[PDB]
Amino acid sequence: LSETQDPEEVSVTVKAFMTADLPNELIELLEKIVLDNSVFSEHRNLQNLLILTAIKADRTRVMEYINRLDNYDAPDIANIAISNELFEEAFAIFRKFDVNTSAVQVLIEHIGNLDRAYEFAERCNEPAVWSQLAKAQLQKGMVKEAIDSYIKADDPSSYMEVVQAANTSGNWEELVKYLQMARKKARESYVETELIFALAKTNRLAELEEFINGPNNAHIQQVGDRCYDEKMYDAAKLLYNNVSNFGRLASTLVHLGEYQAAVDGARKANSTRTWKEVC
Amino acid sequence: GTEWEKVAQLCDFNPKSSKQCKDVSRLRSVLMSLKQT
Amino acid sequence: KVANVELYYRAIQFYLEFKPLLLNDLLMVLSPRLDHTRAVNYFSKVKQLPLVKPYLRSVQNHNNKSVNESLNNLFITEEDYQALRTSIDAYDNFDNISLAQRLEKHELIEFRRIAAYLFKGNNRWKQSVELCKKDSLYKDAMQYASESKDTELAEELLQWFLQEEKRECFGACLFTCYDLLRPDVVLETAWRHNIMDFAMPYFIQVMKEYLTKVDKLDASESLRKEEEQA
Amino acid sequence: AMQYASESKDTELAEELLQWFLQEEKRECFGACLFTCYDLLRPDVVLETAWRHNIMDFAMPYFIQVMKEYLTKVDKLDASESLRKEEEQA
Known part of the structure; x- marks a missing residue:
């Protein structure tokens, strides 16, 4: 402390220390005295020489040095922390600098504790973090819970995997809302096809028939295939x-029961299959 | 009386900044519409 | 002037065993180069934390985790809240849920009020507003709907508010929740309960607003159409 | 006295007049006090002081003309805006 003229006298001795391979609680003590209650609270190689050395201690000392240090490099030391076993500390870093996106990507990748992250994401509010959340909800198959992590984001991306998990568990009421609002974000065709599929699954005929009457831009007869493949009649009737x-249609009107309009469909078909199957 | 007194003392306008929602002006009446009447 | 630090953690124990009353002076002197987290973690074992409370009140500026949690526990035991409001407002390095669990059943209206408050620090309505339904019909549950800034939360609230016939202060339930309401359902459920008295001034402000709206828009369109000519 | 308010062409002169006109309960010809003083009145205070005195009979036709006028206004303006937006295309 008496020196107080330049960092050369410091650099020499601290490099000797760094090279001396002094055990733990030998080098960081010098840093703990010189950083606190003195001038050299700077960052000129004071970062890992203390923080990594405390990571060589593997103790809560890191937390106190964090809360009692400033103007220090956050991202590199956070990556060094998560490269090691210490993760609560880097979580506290991104919490301290209020970097929400960098936090949950680390929480989930390290521990996968959605119960601790979902509340942290409730406190914050960002579509990036909600997208990370839904991406995590997929990992556990929380298809019901992967949705609200997109409602607050309105991110239509990764909908293909949403569909891959949707058929895995019949939930054809909330996918309806997801796709209904994501309609206004990605004017695609998969959205509308799977939308009418979910609608017919939940038999919302009164508006399933109305959505089609607008600019559907969908692929009818591909979900019309699914109507009779799954045999949900009164649906291919409207598709x-x-x-x-x-x-x-007449192949389904076989199973419907109507005959008067079946032959009216056949007279305009005039195909062998149509006629004979109606007969 | 006790009804207007109830709703009045329960809540009433004050010089806040949350009035930017729709710029309420019924405060002017409901303050003393049927109160004192 | 000491080199190492463990002698601090031994000397705190020394005084505490011998001269605990003259410990606050050392604590104030030694707080700078000291991990206060270990101090509170060690004091929790011996449990003399109620002694060192005013010292931690000074150390709070550092915004440490265990410091906040412990001092809030001591405010809970002491049954004081005015300082607790300052702690939570000025400092946030702590979990809100654990504190909420204690405050929402602290036998006392005000602590439970705080338990309802800090939920919105996590952006979690539908429990706070619902928690204070149980006790506070004194306007407090009504106020959180305005700051919630979320439709279909006051609507549920107002419908419940008419499930019990406390129509007296229904007129306030729309004053602060004004922008979060559509006159359609308002007029509907008001005509339902055969209530228009202390319900009309909503419609009065509305028949001022939209009148000014249509007049202003007619003026702007007349201006634009007149400028279309030149 | 009721007629001079119309030619006065000055707001906050009939309002005082109508308020005094209800200070005495001669509500019978209140309905005329707005017919000629129509343009010099804002439906806000009208509806307010009418609900105050629990009077809507021989008070509504004011609001009837108003719910004709502003309906035509919003319809006409929607028409003009639709026209302008359609002409924005070409």
Whole structure:
């Protein structure tokens, strides 16, 4: 402390220390005295020489040095922390600098404690963190819970995997809302096809028939395939109606029971299969 | 009386900044609409 | 002037065993180059933390975790809250849920009020607002709806508010929750309960607002159409 | 006295007049006090002081003309804006 003119006299001795391979609680003590209650609270190689040395201690000392140090490099030392076993500390770093996105990516990748992260993300509010959350909800298959992590984000991305998990568990009521609002974010066709599929699954006919009457831009007859493949009749009745696929509707009207309009579909078909199956 | 007194002393306008929502002006009446009447 | 630090953690024990009353002076002198987290962790074992409370009140500036949690526990035991409001407002390095668990059943209206408060620090309505339904019909549950800034939270609230016939202060339930309401359902459920008295001034402000709106818009459109000519 | 308010063409002169006109309960010809003083009145205070005295009979036709006028206003303005937006395309 008496020196107080330049960092050369400091650099020489601290480099000797760093090279001397002094055990723990020998070098960081010098730093703990010179950083606190003195001038050299700077960052000129004071970062790992203390913080890594405390990571060579593997103690709560890191937390006190964090809370009682400033103007120090956050991202590199955070990556060094998570490269090691200490993760609560880097979590406290990103909490301290209020970097929400950098925090949950570390929490989940290290420990995967959604119960600790979901509340942290409740405190914050950012579509990036909500997207990280839904991405994590996929990992555990929380398809019901992977949705609200997209409602607050309105991020239509990764919807393909949302669909991969959707058929895995019948939840054809909340996917409806997800896709209904993501409609206004990604004017795609997968969205509308799987939308009408979910609608027919939950038999929301009154508006399933209305969505199609607008600019659907969808692929009818591909979910119309799924109508009779899964055999959800009174659905292909409406899909093929405004698409005029006389010949495939009648195969379902077989199972519907109506005969008067079946032959009216066949007279406009005039195909062998249509006629004979109606007969 | 006790009804207008109730709703009045329960809540009433004050010089805050949350009035930017819709710039309420019914304060002017409801302060003394039927109170004192 | 000592080189090492463990002698601090031994000398605190020394005084505490011998001259605990003259410990606060050392604590104030030695706080700078000291890990206060270890100090509180060690004091929790011996449990003389109620002695060192005013010292931690000074150390709070550093915003340490265990410091905040312990001092809030001591405010809980002491049954004081005015200082607790300052602690939570000025400092946030602590979990809100653990404190909430204690405050929401602290036998006391004010502590439970805080238990309802800090929920919104986590952006978690629907429990705070619902927690204070149980006790506070004194306007406090009504106020959180305005800051919530979320539709279909006051609507549920107002519908419940008419499930019990306390229509007296319904008129306030829309004053602060004004922007979060659509006159359609308001007029509907008001005509339902055959209530228009202390319900109309909502519609009065509305029939001022939208009148000014249509007049202003007619003026702007007349201006634009007149400027279309030139 | 009621007629001079119309030609006065000055707001906050009929308002005082109508308030005094209700200070005495001669509500019978209140309905005329707004017919000629129509443009010099804002429905806010009108509805307010009418609900105050628990009077809507021979007070509503003011609001009837108003719920004709502003309906035509919003419809006309929607029409003009639709026209302008359609002409924005070409």
